[PDB]
Design a protein around this ligand. Structure first.
Ligand SMILES: *[C@@H]1O[C@H](CO)[C@@H](O)[C@H](O)[C@H]1NC(C)=O
Lengths: 41, 50
């Protein structure tokens, strides 16, 4: 499963202290096993 | 012999868990190092339907 949210911000240093709930995008019957991950850029 | 079942594993499959992996099963203290031997065996067996 996957969820997300986007927001504008003013503070650059680290996460702004506040609240805004994430909403679902995907569900898949993958069967495959995850133990590790990595970011792409 | 085209139809097979796994006879050996480290632990039971969880609900709807699928596990193809072809590792030679070490049953005892002696490692397989990729081949059968003393307390070491191939993971599958077949019904051999006649
Ligand atoms: C994922 O796979 C490993 C073997 O690569 C296994 O030992 C582990 O138990 C599996 N994890 C889950 C959450 O089933």
């Amino acid at each position: 499963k996957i969820y997300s949210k986007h927001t504008p911000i003013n503070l650059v240093r680290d996460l702004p202290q506040g609240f805004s709930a994430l909403e679902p995008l995907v569900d898949l019957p993958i069967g495959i096993n995850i133990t590790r991950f990595q970011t792409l850029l | 012999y085209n139809y097979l079942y796994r006879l050996f594993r480290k632990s039971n499959l969880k609900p709807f868990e699928r596990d193809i992996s072809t590792e030679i099963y070490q049953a005892g203290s002696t490692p397989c190092n990729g081949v059968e031997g003393f307390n070491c065996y191939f993971p599958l067996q077949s019904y051999g339907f006649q």
